[model samples]
Target: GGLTDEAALSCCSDADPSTKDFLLQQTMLRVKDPKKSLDFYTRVLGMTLIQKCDFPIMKFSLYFLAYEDKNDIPKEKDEKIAWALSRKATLELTHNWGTEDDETQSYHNGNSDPRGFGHIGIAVPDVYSACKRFEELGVKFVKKPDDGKMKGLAFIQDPDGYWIEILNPNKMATLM
Candidate 1:
């Protein structure tokens, strides 16, 4: 519904071999602690910890987290999750392990407009109720529910103080 999506789609749709071959399989974010971020993503966002591998030789580790509907047939399933991969859109969280003990580097500052690259937009079934649930879970809201020009847009802050925009397609209004 905005320029970012348009640009991403257009850029990925390029005929260039590199662009076409690009897997676009992962999204990485540097977090203060992988465990902390992993907890939030898996518990709060309903994502599953598909795999966790340590790369002690490289001084880093990899954690693959994902979301899948209950109805969907997962690629792998266990007691903890019923995760699946779909051609439909999905979100993946990647945590960089080495940064946890690296005091010399600055990772994420807060999600200021031009810094930290902003937040991820997670589409939900309902805006108001979702905000309420998040509030109950102690997740901070960057902007409350103010159905002003935008019918169902709300902002939230993650544990790392990154802004996340939650939108409700059901409440979307037709533009004039």
Candidate 2:
């Protein structure tokens, strides 16, 4: 009959109003080389390098940053709290650099197309033109859009062999 803090915090009452804020977002990709992946995302994609850290036992950099503006996150990790204040929606690129003979290979190797984790869906204005721009920018596409099949959609792959689904949800909500 009594409410616990855990219960109170976990419950989402119908009377509660939505804040409608984009708090945080994240994306993860498995890579053969973490350093190379990070460099490509930062330099080619034009994403800022917020910060990176490595734990005592780990031999990798946990990098974080905002891919676009309006995503405001603190630059430095809070030492007093022993944690980061806030990090933008992270595009996590994990590399299997040294662990070549480990059992955690499915997280690294597979059919390569539509593998363990399917794909990441991104929204753009015009799927057709956007695909063209990506083509000109040296980005390869796996699937192209249909002529009249709802909203335009396409697919592409990252360097790590992960798939990315691109759709124009704004132009035609039917795709979503």
Candidate 3:
């Protein structure tokens, strides 16, 4: 049952070694409010809204965002999708139209009770400066850089209460 068993882990790898090349298309998460989520990701996180598609029939909307310039995104629909898929990392926010209308609408952030999902991480150039900027912006912090025993690392909560780990690669390098 140990993960070190080669035969047991072989099934997890690609069957054809020739097709080893792969890329991360995107990671999707549900949000209760589109406007708030968009603001948090686009304005706060500095991610661009690469694509927005609405499905009135399904009463849901998909928002694709990435940390890239708007002009850099492709104009053609097919090319746009492909461009989004080509990024090293892309965030997909799904908003259900009905969630805004309901007073009890809320999604589990996976940090409570039966904790299944943890959090997403974003590497910053300066953790201290980033945390300071977040403080000025009035962003809620689940754990500040100096709050816990682990110094120089921080966590901020999005509008939907999803935790985001903030770190500085340069600072971390010194620690390592």
- How many residue pairs clash per model? 0, 1, 0
Which numbered prediction scores highest in TM-score against the true structure? 3
Error of 2 at 25 (Å): 4.0
What local lDDT does model 2 show for residue 104? 51
Ranked by TM-score, the better of candidates 2 and 3 is 3
Task: Quote the lDDT for 92 in model 1.
Answer: 48
Best-fitting candidate, scored by lDDT:
3
Q: What is the TM-score of each candidate against the true structure?
A: 0.66, 0.60, 0.87
Instruction: Provide the lowest-lDDT 10-residue window in model 2.
Output: 79-88
Give one digit per residue, the lDDT tens place, for model 1 in 1-176: 65797687876744777666444445555566776777787777787666555666665666666565445445454632323232233444445556666777555644554564766778888888888888899887778877567656898876666677888876675432
> If candidate 2 were superposed on the true structure by all CA atoms, what would the RMSD be?
8.4
Q: Which ranges of candidate 3 are over 4 A from the true structure?
A: 1-18
Better of 2 and 3 by lDDT: 3
Q: Which of the predicted structures, 1 or 2, would earn the higher lDDT when compared with the native?
A: 1
What is candidate 3's lDDT per residue for 1-176, written digit by digit as tens? Answer: 56777777776855587766776778889998888899999888899999888999998999998889899998899999878778878889999888866898799999999799899899998888989989999999999987866679999998889999998877777774
TM-score of 1: 0.66
